[PDB]
């Protein structure tokens, strides 16, 4: 579309403040659960990444929610599923910082 | 020829670098030739800004003149115009400091 | 909230695969003609996720260089440049050396 | 209709595997003309060869001398009347 070289424009929008997938460890809370192993050892969430056009402005979330996602708790005669909830962002926004 | 293009200042593969500051005037100078061309000012991402009074003013020989600009306006503002099916777009990058 | 993301998908979306990471572009040479690069960060495909155990690490099995056009604002009517990075196409869980 | 002997579970079978040893993915089938694929997300897919990877309808997949590649989730897949059926298998080693 716009080169083998990623064009400016396509570079900016791609690297702009939006919610995006970030690997995150298991939550202190399901790290305590009585289980022989926890599968997987990490969960990918959606979080305000990218960057603002300033040192001053920071990419923050204007829309967010807790995701319930089931983790496998290998244990006992039979493994079972446990629910892990954490912070996940849907809407993001580049906003001014704090002092 | 390419005559039929809505936007006066040609090109826009690279946006025009416009210096600005919060609280003061912002001019997105995407002036068209013919007065009656439908131009829609956007702002990456999905928030379009529509003319009125101060907070947005449309001018054919000038452009979108924003009184009391904010951070909401810092970055890539795109001017769009569809002429005979073809969607022309000119780009403008703002900043401070 | 919404619905409980099923384990299959939690696992699916948690394995060693190439995934988009925000790379802040401060690390390199930042002196040029005085100013800042735009954007001041990039998005690139990189091996991520967690492997079955601490014994295995998540490494790339295919990568490439990505030339990405970057604008460096400064003096005077400032110019647009280039940079290359390491994008990952395929990954795998390998035992740590 | 379902090709795999064990009814589907959200919980995969746990297997205590070890490298260099024999690994069995015990997804035996109910009928004899079924082409069962052993898949491994992301996209790794183990193609049997008759020796190193052995398919058998009354036992499943048999892998003499398991590797690190085999640590993780292994999914037996089968298509019956278009309907894709999968049985997930989680393998792990000590430590």
């Amino acid at each position: 579309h716009q080169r083998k070289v990623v064009s400016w424009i396509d570079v900016y929008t791609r690297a702009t403040c939006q919610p995006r997938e970030v690997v995150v460890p298991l939550t202190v809370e399901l790290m305590g659960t009585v289980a022989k192993q926890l599968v997987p050892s990490c969960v990918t969430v959606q979080r305000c990444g990218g960057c603002c056009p300033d040192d001053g402005l920071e990419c923050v979330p204007t829309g967010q929610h807790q995701v319930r996602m089931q983790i496998l708790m290998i244990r006992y005669p039979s493994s079972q599923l446990g629910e892990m909830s954490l912070e996940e962002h849907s809407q993001c926004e580049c906003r001014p910082k704090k002092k | 020829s390419d005559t039929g293009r809505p936007f006066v200042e040609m090109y826009s593969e690279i946006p025009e670098i416009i210096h600005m500051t919060e609280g003061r005037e912002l001019v997105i100078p995407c002036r068209v030739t013919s007065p009656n061309i439908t131009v829609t000012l956007k702002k990456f991402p999905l928030d379009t800004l529509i003319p009125d009074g101060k907070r947005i003013i449309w001018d054919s020989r000038k452009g979108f003149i924003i009184s009391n600009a904010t951070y909401k306006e810092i970055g890539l503002l795109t001017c769009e115009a569809t002429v005979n099916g073809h969607l022309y777009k000119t780009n403008y990058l703002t900043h401070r400091q």
Side-chain angles (χ1 to χ4, degrees), chain A residues 10-28 30-75 77-82:
Chain A
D10 265 322
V11 58
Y12 194 78
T13 56
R14 193 184 172 175
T16 303
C17 175
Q18 58 186 301
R20 43 187 76 208
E21 34 101 328
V22 163
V23 184
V24 148
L26 257 59
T27 50
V28 182
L30 263 81
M31 287 213 269
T33 306
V34 199
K36 194 193 179 312
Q37 197 177 339
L38 297 146
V39 181
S41 291
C42 71
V43 298
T44 310
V45 282
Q46 201 193 39
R47 302 279 184 91
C48 299
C51 58
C52 296
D54 257 334
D55 284 294
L57 301 176
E58 66 174 19
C59 185
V60 287
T62 47
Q64 67 158 279
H65 60 272
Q66 299 289 102
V67 232
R68 312 113 63 77
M69 45 187 50
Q70 33 197 37
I71 266 57
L72 194 71
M73 305 175 300
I74 313 172
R75 87 223 294 211
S78 193
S79 305
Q80 66 158 61
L81 294 160

